[PDB]
Design a protein around this ligand. Structure first.
Ligand SMILES: [Mg+2]
Ligand SMILES: [Mg+2]
Ligand SMILES: [Mg+2]
Ligand SMILES: [Mg+2]
Ligand SMILES: [Mg+2]
Ligand SMILES: [Mg+2]
Ligand SMILES: [Mg+2]
Ligand SMILES: [Mg+2]
Ligand SMILES: [Mg+2]
Ligand SMILES: [Mg+2]
Ligand SMILES: [Mg+2]
Ligand SMILES: [Mg+2]
Ligand SMILES: [Mg+2]
Ligand SMILES: [Mg+2]
Ligand SMILES: [Mg+2]
Ligand SMILES: [Mg+2]
Ligand SMILES: [Mg+2]
Ligand SMILES: [Mg+2]
Ligand SMILES: [Mg+2]
Ligand SMILES: [Mg+2]
Ligand SMILES: [Mg+2]
Ligand SMILES: [Mg+2]
Ligand SMILES: [Mg+2]
Ligand SMILES: [Mg+2]
Ligand SMILES: [Mg+2]
Ligand SMILES: [Mg+2]
Ligand SMILES: [Mg+2]
Ligand SMILES: [Mg+2]
Ligand SMILES: [Mg+2]
Ligand SMILES: [Mg+2]
Ligand SMILES: [Mg+2]
Ligand SMILES: [Mg+2]
Ligand SMILES: [Mg+2]
Ligand SMILES: [Mg+2]
Ligand SMILES: [Mg+2]
Ligand SMILES: [Mg+2]
Ligand SMILES: [Mg+2]
Ligand SMILES: [Mg+2]
Ligand SMILES: [Mg+2]
Ligand SMILES: [Mg+2]
Ligand SMILES: [Mg+2]
Ligand SMILES: [Mg+2]
Ligand SMILES: [Mg+2]
Ligand SMILES: [Mg+2]
Ligand SMILES: [Mg+2]
Ligand SMILES: [Mg+2]
Ligand SMILES: [Mg+2]
Ligand SMILES: [Mg+2]
Ligand SMILES: [Mg+2]
Ligand SMILES: [Mg+2]
Ligand SMILES: [Mg+2]
Ligand SMILES: [Mg+2]
Ligand SMILES: [Mg+2]
Ligand SMILES: [Mg+2]
Ligand SMILES: [Mg+2]
Ligand SMILES: [Mg+2]
Ligand SMILES: [Mg+2]
Ligand SMILES: [Mg+2]
Ligand SMILES: [Mg+2]
Ligand SMILES: [Mg+2]
Ligand SMILES: [Mg+2]
Ligand SMILES: [Mg+2]
Ligand SMILES: [Mg+2]
Ligand SMILES: [Mg+2]
Ligand SMILES: [Mg+2]
Ligand SMILES: [Mg+2]
Ligand SMILES: [Mg+2]
Ligand SMILES: [Mg+2]
Ligand SMILES: [Mg+2]
Ligand SMILES: [Mg+2]
Ligand SMILES: [Mg+2]
Ligand SMILES: [Mg+2]
Ligand SMILES: [Mg+2]
Ligand SMILES: [Mg+2]
Ligand SMILES: [Mg+2]
Ligand SMILES: [Mg+2]
Ligand SMILES: [Mg+2]
Ligand SMILES: [Mg+2]
Ligand SMILES: [Mg+2]
Ligand SMILES: [Mg+2]
Ligand SMILES: [Mg+2]
Ligand SMILES: [Mg+2]
Ligand SMILES: [Mg+2]
Ligand SMILES: [Mg+2]
Ligand SMILES: [Mg+2]
Ligand SMILES: [Mg+2]
Ligand SMILES: [Mg+2]
Ligand SMILES: [Mg+2]
Ligand SMILES: [Mg+2]
Ligand SMILES: [Mg+2]
Ligand SMILES: [Mg+2]
Ligand SMILES: [Mg+2]
Ligand SMILES: [Mg+2]
Ligand SMILES: [Mg+2]
Ligand SMILES: [Mg+2]
Ligand SMILES: [Mg+2]
Ligand SMILES: [Mg+2]
Ligand SMILES: [Mg+2]
Lengths: 135, 208
RNA sequence: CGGCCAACUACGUGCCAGCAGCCGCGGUAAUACGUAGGGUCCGAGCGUUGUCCGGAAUUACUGGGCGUAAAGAGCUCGUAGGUGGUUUGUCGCGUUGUUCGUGAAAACUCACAGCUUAACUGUGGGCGUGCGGGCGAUACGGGCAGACUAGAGUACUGCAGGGGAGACUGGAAUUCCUGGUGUAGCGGUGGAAUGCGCAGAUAUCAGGAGGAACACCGGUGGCGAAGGCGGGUCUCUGGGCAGUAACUGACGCUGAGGAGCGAAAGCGUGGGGAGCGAACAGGAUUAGAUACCCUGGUAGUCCACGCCGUAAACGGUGGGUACUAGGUGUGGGUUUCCUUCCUUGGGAUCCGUGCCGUAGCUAACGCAUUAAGUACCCCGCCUGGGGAGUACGGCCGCAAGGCUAAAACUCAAAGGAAUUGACGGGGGCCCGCACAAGCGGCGGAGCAUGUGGAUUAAUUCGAUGCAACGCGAAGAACCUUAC
RNA sequence: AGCUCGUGUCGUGAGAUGUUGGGUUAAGUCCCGCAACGAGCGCAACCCUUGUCUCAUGUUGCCAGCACGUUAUGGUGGGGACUCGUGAGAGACUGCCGGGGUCAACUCGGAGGAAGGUGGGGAUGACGUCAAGUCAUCAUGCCCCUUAUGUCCAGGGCUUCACACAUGCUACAAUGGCCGGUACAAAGGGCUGCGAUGCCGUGAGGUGGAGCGAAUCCUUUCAAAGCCGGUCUCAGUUCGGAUCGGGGUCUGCAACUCGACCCCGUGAAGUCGGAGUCGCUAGUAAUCGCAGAUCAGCAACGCUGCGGUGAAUACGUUCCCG
């Protein structure tokens, strides 16, 4: 949904907010809501919504990636730029309007057609599942 | 002027009085004796920084409380300094007085003690840079305290001009009356003149 | 012994006395002045001064640029010179192909050796980077001795165009004149008055006269080498583009000096002269206007013949050639195919002209096949800012003037792009008794205190717009009280 | 209401981003997309007072309901049923609805409610600027006097005055001055101080002195404007009070410069005001009183706060200042 600028490059900053989000989950699961004023209760619920909506993957990655896979690089230039800046290998779908040197292992296809996008994502997910069984 | 004393500002809610008694008849003499004894304590005792001075008085009895980082030199193992202080008190005729000595739990978390330490370092040879680096790091070593600022004004290094420089680290809500602000200041001595040191200490907040 | 630049403190005078190679150092508390110590460098020498090279790639052949900092001449034609599109043939004059043959001595560089080692010199080499003739080579780099054509030109058919010159001609508008009608104003600016009217203005109708220029089409469009070029019509003519490729078969390019064209203004002669409009009069504003504003209007603006030859003459970029990703419009011409064969239909091709963008270049803005990209050929221009595009001299011009183009002295900077504030009589969106609608006030007079200014032996001192002034003074016969 | 920082990215470098643009808010308040992610000083909130209700709760304070007063009134025996005062708690959070809104912030209208969209006012001054003010609050480096520029009183002047500016008071007169009658406040001070009742003074005040370290006693039962009655018929005036002289009180050793207050005569000046200029958008403006305070008197119309009577308008940013 949302790509935070340099979250992979600037990981020491977002590690603190992963700590904060885990702490907030732990405190919320306890059940303490009436101990705070309703104004800050509403504020914390809103920030739960915001951060949960904008942050999905760093909850589960923690230990930083080894490869980065991107769709529609001309709009997603930020991710691939950070990937080359950090030296992480890049695998992405290049359309007719994309720079070929940006992706280390290009995969020709369409980012604009849901059929092709879903099929390519399913193929790569099947490859990942096969590797996961193969460990 | 820029800012009023935070202690005076939040004196009504979060902080408490150091001197507590009631007088209508001779209150001028009560306060003049108080200020006289506090001046003599400040003049005589400089080796040991007196963090706080507190007195409570009923009728004739008066009980003075002295807070210091360490009591070893404030009160001797035999009591020479205590005897000298009692002698000064009876010379000003403070009638029957009982003294209490309390040592602080964290010397680096109190405004007056760190201010006196920085003042001594600046006075002898220590440069303001390294002095404030050491003070700030010793401050943030303690977990309880969160936000720190220290400021100095005057002639720094003997130059013929006035430098006003400060360092900030953490959260110090001056405007928030709930904030627990510990204020301290001292006037350091130097060959070229005098320099003032100003410090604010934030330590949590209170609800209720 | 401030930073450049290995070496700091105290004492003495403070915009004085003084230092200094660049920045630059003293306006009572100087590591920069003078003296002390202390340390640094060097040493029988130590510094100052002057000349020469280096850094200075700061005269750039190796090894610089010309968009804005210094520079593309205004642009063409073109002489002398410099440089050439393929392959078909000798001599070897640009040239390397090896050898013998000179390179005086001395010096430099290598090794040896002697003065005890030192300068000094003792011996033998080696070095002695250029030039002479005899013998042996032919790939490039030239003339010479023969053929073809990928540059160029011509030839056949079409093409669009404000390309240029002369002549003829059209309408609208302004002004003026003549004649009606028609009444007291018309013109003017932020406001008014000089201006024309009551002798008949303005307005309006009819007619005529004369001069300039062509509104729409008309555009970031066409042409020209560049200045520039547009009412039609005729007359003559240049340049450019596409296809067939018939023919010429090294004719190509740029071009120092030289010569021709050239915006506006200016000059001579002789005509023209409606509108516009330097100069000059008045009226207006301002303390002041010899300007901005208003009313008038003489050169000029028009024509013919000559002249001067300068513009921010800009794409601030010379021309020519070959190569290097695209997208979106316009103009001109050839073709082919959905094919109605109507259609900016679709495709191919060449030329011209706008916009945005890669890689790349650039200090940046930015350029980006119509390069500032990567190169080749030639030509002009620049070496810190003033002086100065000026004096003298030379050339042209009848003159105004134009071209060629210095030196002394002075400054230690002047300049190009870009970042951020501040300001704005630059703009948009917002705030407040800021205005608007308001009551009550002060500024006219008594009061009772405070402040400047003048007297006295003192009239203590401090605060002088916002943010001082019934302020410290929220209490003067002694005190306060400092004179 | 803006001011910054850590990581990252672009350029090479000053730097830039974050802090931009759209919507919204009193505000860097919030939301949308973006080489930004976040954090700090800010801003709002937390504090005091003020607006309501409930509980707790009756004396020196009030009196619903009972008795004694008999001219002096809760004055007296009695009581929390209310204010009175001070504790705890509750109550404004777009709480709910309709419409616009990117279905998001937010806005207008509507019901409840005391308040509606920070209810009102305060304390609360981010980085910095003016080398801003203060060596006469205090403390201090340097220089200067040390037999003086030190100390003490041989008294005086800080207040002198041909004139200007600055901020106030009282007015310029009838919405008034004066005279008589007459009802409502808050808060606060008092030990070498507040000072009752009483007597004498026009009145400053004098004798005398109860009650108080203080909801009690004194600051009068805290009043003034406010209401009724009478005069003035618009005059330099019954407005207006200075100036000067004549007589006393008060603090004090001693009132000439150089005090204040009380009494008399004193009768000048001035009729809403020149350009320009100030403050005020709800208890506000405007007007009338009281009190903290320094003090022994006093230049006390001042500063500060406590009160009383109490308006008008906002069509909107084109112009002036920030
Ligand atoms: Mg040195
Ligand atoms: Mg050195
Ligand atoms: Mg000195
Ligand atoms: Mg030495
Ligand atoms: Mg040299
Ligand atoms: Mg070369
Ligand atoms: Mg060069
Ligand atoms: Mg230039
Ligand atoms: Mg040029
Ligand atoms: Mg020229
Ligand atoms: Mg020739
Ligand atoms: Mg030969
Ligand atoms: Mg030979
Ligand atoms: Mg030879
Ligand atoms: Mg020889
Ligand atoms: Mg040599
Ligand atoms: Mg030998
Ligand atoms: Mg030799
Ligand atoms: Mg040589
Ligand atoms: Mg040749
Ligand atoms: Mg042939
Ligand atoms: Mg040909
Ligand atoms: Mg044509
Ligand atoms: Mg002609
Ligand atoms: Mg006529
Ligand atoms: Mg006419
Ligand atoms: Mg004419
Ligand atoms: Mg042929
Ligand atoms: Mg040619
Ligand atoms: Mg040529
Ligand atoms: Mg030529
Ligand atoms: Mg030439
Ligand atoms: Mg030439
Ligand atoms: Mg000619
Ligand atoms: Mg000619
Ligand atoms: Mg002309
Ligand atoms: Mg001309
Ligand atoms: Mg002339
Ligand atoms: Mg002529
Ligand atoms: Mg003529
Ligand atoms: Mg004219
Ligand atoms: Mg004119
Ligand atoms: Mg005339
Ligand atoms: Mg004139
Ligand atoms: Mg020129
Ligand atoms: Mg031109
Ligand atoms: Mg040219
Ligand atoms: Mg070329
Ligand atoms: Mg083309
Ligand atoms: Mg590139
Ligand atoms: Mg570059
Ligand atoms: Mg481009
Ligand atoms: Mg080109
Ligand atoms: Mg170039
Ligand atoms: Mg000059
Ligand atoms: Mg010149
Ligand atoms: Mg000459
Ligand atoms: Mg010339
Ligand atoms: Mg520039
Ligand atoms: Mg700029
Ligand atoms: Mg307002
Ligand atoms: Mg107004
Ligand atoms: Mg006034
Ligand atoms: Mg006045
Ligand atoms: Mg003074
Ligand atoms: Mg002033
Ligand atoms: Mg003021
Ligand atoms: Mg006053
Ligand atoms: Mg005075
Ligand atoms: Mg005295
Ligand atoms: Mg600001
Ligand atoms: Mg980088
Ligand atoms: Mg953002
Ligand atoms: Mg910002
Ligand atoms: Mg920014
Ligand atoms: Mg930006
Ligand atoms: Mg904002
Ligand atoms: Mg914030
Ligand atoms: Mg706040
Ligand atoms: Mg009752
Ligand atoms: Mg600030
Ligand atoms: Mg200052
Ligand atoms: Mg002084
Ligand atoms: Mg001091
Ligand atoms: Mg002193
Ligand atoms: Mg005096
Ligand atoms: Mg005095
Ligand atoms: Mg003033
Ligand atoms: Mg009166
Ligand atoms: Mg009365
Ligand atoms: Mg009454
Ligand atoms: Mg009496
Ligand atoms: Mg009177
Ligand atoms: Mg008058
Ligand atoms: Mg009158
Ligand atoms: Mg007026
Ligand atoms: Mg009044
Ligand atoms: Mg007093």
């Amino acid at each position: 949904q949302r790509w935070l600028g340099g979250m992979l490059t600037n990981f020491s900053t977002v590690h603190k907010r992963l700590q904060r989000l885990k702490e907030l989950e732990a405190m919320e699961q306890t059940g303490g809501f009436e101990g705070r004023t309703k104004k800050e209760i509403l504020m914390l619920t809103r920030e739960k919504n915001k951060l949960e909506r904008s942050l999905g993957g760093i909850r589960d990655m923690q230990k930083v990636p080894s490869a980065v896979w991107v769709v529609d690089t001309n709009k997603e230039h930020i991710a691939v730029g950070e990937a080359r800046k950090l030296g992480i290998p890049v695998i992405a779908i290049l359309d007719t309007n994309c720079d070929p040197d940006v992706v280390d292992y290009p995969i020709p296809g369409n980012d604009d057609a849901i059929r092709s996008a879903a099929l390519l994502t399913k193929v790569i997910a099947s490859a990942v599942a096969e590797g996961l069984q193969a460990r | 002027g820029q800012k009023i004393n935070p202690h005076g500002f939040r004196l009504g809610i979060t902080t408490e009085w150091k001197s507590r008694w009631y007088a209508d008849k001779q209150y001028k003499d009560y306060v003049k004796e108080d200020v006289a004894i506090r001046k003599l304590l400040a003049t005589g005792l400089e080796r040991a920084g007196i963090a706080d001075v507190e007195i409570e008085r009923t009728r004739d009895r008066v009980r003075v409380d002295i807070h210091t980082a360490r009591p070893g030199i404030v009160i001797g193992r035999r009591g020479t300094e205590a005897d000298r202080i009692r002698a000064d008190l009876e010379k000003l005729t403070g009638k029957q007085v009982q003294l209490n000595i309390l040592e602080v739990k964290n010397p680096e978390s109190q405004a007056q003690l760190v201010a006196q330490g920085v003042a001594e370092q600046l006075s002898n040879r220590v440069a303001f840079r390294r002095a404030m680096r050491k003070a700030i790091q010793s401050a943030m070593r303690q977990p309880n305290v969160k936000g720190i600022r220290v400021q100095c004004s005057g002639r720094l290094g003997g130059a013929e001009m006035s430098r006003s420089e400060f360092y900030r680290e953490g959260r110090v809500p001056l405007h928030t009356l709930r904030a627990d602000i510990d204020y301290g200041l001292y006037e350091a001595k130097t060959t070229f003149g005098r320099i003032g040191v100003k410090v604010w200490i934030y330590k949590g907040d209170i609800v209720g």
